[PDB]
Amino acid sequence: QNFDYMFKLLIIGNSSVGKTSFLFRYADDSFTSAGIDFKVKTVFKNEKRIKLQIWDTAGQYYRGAMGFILMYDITNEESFNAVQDWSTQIKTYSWDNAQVILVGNKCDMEDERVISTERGQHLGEQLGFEFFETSAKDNINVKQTFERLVDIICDKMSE
Numbered sequence: 001q002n003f004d005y006m007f008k009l010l011i012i013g014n015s016s017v018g019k020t021s022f023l024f025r026y027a028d029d030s031f032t033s034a035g036i037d038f039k040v041k042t043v044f045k046n047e048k049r050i051k052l053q054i055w056d057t058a059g060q061y062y063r064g065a066m067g068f069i070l071m072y073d074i075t076n077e078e079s080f081n082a083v084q085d086w087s088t089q090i091k092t093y094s095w096d097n098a099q100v101i102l103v104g105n106k107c108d109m110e111d112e113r114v115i116s117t118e119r120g121q122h123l124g125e126q127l128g129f130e131f132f133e134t135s136a137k138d139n140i141n142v143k144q145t146f147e148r149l150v151d152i153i154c155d156k157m158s159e
């Protein structure tokens with residue numbers, strides 16, 4: 001209730017890549033196969049209490065963002081080819097303090113994977129964004145994405 005810091009976080013990427021599910025898995029530790037612009041979660045980093053305002057309005061503005069989660073779907077090449085456009089919109093129309101994690105979502109759908117782990121890692125290195133493969137569905141690397149984002153926002157905040 002009594003936080004030291006508040007970070008504005010945006011989830012961006014093409015529609016159907018799992019932006020909304022990623023948010024719902026992190027904030028309500030839920031996912032379902034079956035109105036909300038943002039959700040709030042408070043996290044503990046070192047002794048600090050950090051309020052996260054996590055926005056999910058990409059599929060419907062950037063200047064204030066501490067942090068971006070740039071999502072593509074590993075089962076959809078179009079979502080991954082689009083990452084460059086998304087990255088361009090970030091580095092242009094954002095606070096030059098903003099951190100970014102590249103996220104290949106739905107790593108649970110191994111049979112329909114069209115994007116390799118290493119293509120993802122390689123695009124990460126090209127764009128200068130750390131990278132995680134995730135599943136909102138199986139709860140894989142959702143926690144680690146947000147906490148890594150908080151950590152690097154803190155590092156930059158300290159500089």
Ligand SMILES: Nc1nc2c(ncn2[C@@H]2O[C@H](COP(=O)(O)OP(=O)(O)O)[C@@H](O)[C@H]2O)c(=O)[nH]1
Pocket residue numbers: 014015016017018019020021022032033059105106107108109134135136137138
């Ligand atoms: N298999 C799998 N499906 C997912 C995952 N995340 C989301 N989905 C599904 O992919 C579709 C798009 O989800 P949604 O979160 O609405 O995508 P958004 O349009 O980017 O918000 C829905 O059918 C979800 O149930 C995941 O990690 N694994």
Ligand SMILES: [Mg+2]
Pocket residue numbers: 019020056059
């Ligand atoms: Mg959505």
